[PDB]
Amino acid sequence: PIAQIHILEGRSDEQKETLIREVSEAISRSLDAPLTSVRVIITEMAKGHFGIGGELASKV
Amino acid sequence: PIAQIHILEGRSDEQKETLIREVSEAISRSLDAPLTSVRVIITEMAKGHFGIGGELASK
Amino acid sequence: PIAQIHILEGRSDEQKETLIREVSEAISRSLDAPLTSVRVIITEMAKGHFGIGGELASKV
Amino acid sequence: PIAQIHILEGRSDEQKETLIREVSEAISRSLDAPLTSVRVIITEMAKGHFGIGGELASKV
Amino acid sequence: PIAQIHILEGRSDEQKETLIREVSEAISRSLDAPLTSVRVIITEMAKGHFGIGGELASKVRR
Amino acid sequence: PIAQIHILEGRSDEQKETLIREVSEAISRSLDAPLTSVRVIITEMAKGHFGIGGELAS
Ligand SMILES: *C/C=C/C(=O)C(=O)O
Ligand SMILES: *C/C=C/C(=O)C(=O)O
Ligand SMILES: *C/C=C/C(=O)C(=O)O
Ligand SMILES: *C/C=C\C(=O)C(=O)O
Numbered sequence: 001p002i003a004q005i006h007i008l009e010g011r012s013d014e015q016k017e018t019l020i021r022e023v024s025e026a027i028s029r030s031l032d033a034p035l036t037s038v039r040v041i042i043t044e045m046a047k048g049h050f051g052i053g054g055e056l057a058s059k060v
Numbered sequence: 061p062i063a064q065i066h067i068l069e070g071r072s073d074e075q076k077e078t079l080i081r082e083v084s085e086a087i088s089r090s091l092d093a094p095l096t097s098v099r100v101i102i103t104e105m106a107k108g109h110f111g112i113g114g115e116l117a118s119k
Numbered sequence: 120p121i122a123q124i125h126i127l128e129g130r131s132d133e134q135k136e137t138l139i140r141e142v143s144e145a146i147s148r149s150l151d152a153p154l155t156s157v158r159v160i161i162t163e164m165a166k167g168h169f170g171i172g173g174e175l176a177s178k179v
Numbered sequence: 180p181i182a183q184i185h186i187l188e189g190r191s192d193e194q195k196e197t198l199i200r201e202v203s204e205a206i207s208r209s210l211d212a213p214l215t216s217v218r219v220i221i222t223e224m225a226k227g228h229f230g231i232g233g234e235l236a237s238k239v
Numbered sequence: 240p241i242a243q244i245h246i247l248e249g250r251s252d253e254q255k256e257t258l259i260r261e262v263s264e265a266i267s268r269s270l271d272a273p274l275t276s277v278r279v280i281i282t283e284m285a286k287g288h289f290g291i292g293g294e295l296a297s298k299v300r301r
Numbered sequence: 302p303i304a305q306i307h308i309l310e311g312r313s314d315e316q317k318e319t320l321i322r323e324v325s326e327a328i329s330r331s332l333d334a335p336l337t338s339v340r341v342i343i344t345e346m347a348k349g350h351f352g353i354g355g356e357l358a359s
Contacts, residue, residue, distance in 0.1 A: 002241065004067045006220060011091065013349050017357060019090040026082035028350035031075055040067065040352035041307060048192050051219035054203030056196060062181060062218070073167055077175060084173030096298060099181070100170035101125060108252055111279035114263035116256065121303060121340065124182045126210065132287055134210055139290030141205035149198040150190065158303070159290035160245060185342060221342060227314050230341035233325030242306045246332065255333060262332065269338040280322040
């Protein structure tokens with residue numbers, strides 16, 4: 001099981017470390033899969049690179 | 061926040077529903093983001109489509 | 120330029136053909152890039168495989 | 180409907196804003212889906228990270 | 240090192256097994272990384288789901 | 302045929318150029334597909350962005 005998470009840039013290294021752990025755990029729990037097989041990738045998006053309804057998230 | 065999870069095929073609909081909920085929650089908690097903005101995509105892989113060390117996981 | 124579009128299953132082949140064309144055009148226009156270089160991938164999601172707010176889109 | 184677009188680095192913020200809008204619109208039109216549900220992600224590639232025919236795009 | 244490869248549907252299981260092996264090896268060689276860490280995912284695309292120049296590959300291809 | 306490869310940051314431009322070529326070749330060989338149709342994307346990951354067993358690769 002491999003998870004890729006796209007998020008807006010701006011968060012601390014600690015928050016991201018937590019995200020990885022908590023998501024990894026949730027995956028292991030939910031699928032009864034061994035925690036050590038779980039991979040997580042975080043991909044940060046620039047605010048000018050993410051659109052909702054055709055408009056940037058950097059003015060919503 | 062949009063999460064795509066690749067997993068081996070073979071799990072039940074219930075397990076997957078759970079995966080979606082628990083992961084969505086963990087994201088919301090971890091980033092202090094509203095739960096309703098979180099999207100999750102599950103992508104099932106066939107066992108013949110996933111390699112480790114150059115060999116199928118189906119072996 | 121390569122675009123991948125995740126959409127809920129259930130649309131017609133014609134709608135998807137249109138999607139491919141219209142998006143490919145929009146990319147070419149926007150970036151002043153040659154239309155023939157543009158690649159588009161459509162990835163259909165099962166309704167039981169897409170979550171919003173932790174709950175399936177096949178409820179909401 | 181969630182679109183991810185990989186493009187070469189080098190474009191202006193305005194061009195990208197236009198890309199997001201025009202693509203979002205093309206998606207909404209093509210699938211008769213509400214514009215406000217459409218998400219777009221732009222992922223910029225470094226010129227040394229994109230290959231065609233095994234050769235960098237930064238010698239093309 | 241994790242590779243995802245999108246290909247048109249239609250190939251045999253053997254061809255895909257080969258693809259996985261040859262690509263994993265090329266990755267290991269190129270990056271001096273241990274072969275056993277390399278992951279590969281193959282994702283098959285339906286011919287109606289892949290566009291070139293705004294037109295399906297299933298009307299520009301077999 | 303379009304390949305995206307996620308790798309840890311830290312490698313030289315030459316190594317990556319080699320990765321692109323060798324992988325592109327392997328794909329062409331394996332699928333009997335024309336080399337010039339093969340696309341490769343390299344995506345570098347920061348060490349703080351990649352988790353194994355819930356822990357950073359650092
Ligand atoms: C990951 C980004 C999602 C949002 O910001 C939102 O929809 O509110
Ligand atoms: C592409 C998925 C998003 C929706 O359909 C929506 O939330 O409206
Ligand atoms: C990987 C699919 C692409 C083609 O078929 C091509 O570019 O000719
Ligand atoms: C890319 C796959 C994982 C690793 O690099 C590792 O095993 O550290």
